[PDB]
Amino acid sequence: GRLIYTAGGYFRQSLSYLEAYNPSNGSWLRLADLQVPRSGLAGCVVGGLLYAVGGRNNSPDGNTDSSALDCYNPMTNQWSPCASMSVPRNRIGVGVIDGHIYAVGGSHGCIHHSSVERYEPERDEWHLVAPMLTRRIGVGVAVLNRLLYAVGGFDGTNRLNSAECYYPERNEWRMITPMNTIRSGAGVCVLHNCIYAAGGYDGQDQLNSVERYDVETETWTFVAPMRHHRSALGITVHQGKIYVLGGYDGHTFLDSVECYDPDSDTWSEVTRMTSGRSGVGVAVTMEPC
């Protein structure tokens, strides 16, 4: 059985929580805390290991953007440090291609990154690759057909409807069709042949709208909106369904988890996180121990 892991996030300050939700039975487990609290981080999995990438420790004692990569082994319930990235990356996006982790965009103070770098677990090494054509923080990232997509975000001046694609064998970024909606701090993931962008912030309002990019047709289409408006949501895919976790609706730090069924085109309430939070990192792997 596979669990949805939620790492870090933010309520009043950055959080070190790691909890796992089991869609088979509705249960949550609290597991080993992150060594350093962090929000605006991303989660991913490689070789059954869970990686926590970037973010920022918002704390009474000071605010520190994170260049960290940390690894969680469900067998041991332990976090281990890995090599750090070239630069701190708050409000990061991440994607995995052929066992390598791409860290995309994010901020370091008022620096809004276009830079992109790639982690090789077998060497414990990061290396920079071609930078994006756009500076993007709060960027959505997904992998489809071993191509890496950077969707939306904030460029230091505007929230973006734009999106682009990285072609590894050419070390080259190219723009794709822009989204119909400006989305910064959205949830972005892949399901079947489409990149989904759920929620985010458009410069005025947190969004409940959801749209998907079909690579074969190069168009974005709206699907059913989520029940909750949300920015800074976590998102993942588990057994052919999209799950969205937490975020911010202009009023509340949400504990809502919703899931999307693409065949009925419907969203439904699935569970509540143990406490409301925004800016989490999420991924799916095997259950611990």
Ligand X SMILES: CN(C)C(=O)c1cccc(-c2cccc(-n3ncc(C(=O)O)c3[C@@H]3C[C@H]3c3cn(C)nn3)c2)c1
Contacts with Cl ion by CB under 5 A lie at: 40, 56
**Binding letters toward ligand X, positions 96-135, x by CB under 6 A:** ----------------------------------------
Instruction: List the one residue out of 137, 141, 167, 175 whose CA is nearest residue 154.
Output: 137
**Tokens of residue 204, six digits:** 């005025």
What is the maximal distance between C-alpha atoms in the chain? Answer: 50
Distance from C-alpha of 249 to C-alpha of 203, rounded to nearest angstrom: 13
User: Beta strand pairing status for 13-14 and 39-46?
Assistant: unpaired
Q: Which CB sits closer to ligand X, 74 or 93?
A: 93
Query: If contact means CB under 5 to 8 A according to the sort of partner, which of Cl ion, ligand X, none does residue 137 touch?
Result: ligand X
Answer yes or no whether residue 138 interacts with ligand X by CB under 6 A. Answer: yes
What is the SS3 assignment for 47? Answer: coil
Residue 83 structure tokens: 């090599």
Among 196, 248, 260, 267, binds ligand X (CB under 6 A): 248
Q: CA of 213: how far to CAs of 12, 220, 223, 261, 285, in Å?
A: 35, 4, 11, 17, 26
**β-bridge pairing 28-30 and 18-21:** antiparallel
Q: Which of 201, 213, 220, 267 binds ligand X (CB under 6 A)?
A: 201
Confirm or reject binding of residue 10 to ligand X (CB under 6 A): yes
Minimum CB separation from Cl ion for residue 231, in Å?
Answer: 12
Least distance in Å: CB of 206 to ligand X?
5
Question: What is the closest distance, in whole angstroms, from the C-beta atom of residue 135 to Cl ion in the complex?
Answer: 16
3-class SS of residue 265 = coil
Binding-site partner at residue 101 among ligand X, Cl ion, none, CB < 5 to 8 Å by type: none
- Is residue 185 a contact residue for ligand X (CB under 6 A)? yes
Contacts with ligand X by CB under 6 A lie at: 10, 39-40, 91, 137-138, 154, 159, 184-185, 201, 206, 231-232, 248, 278-279
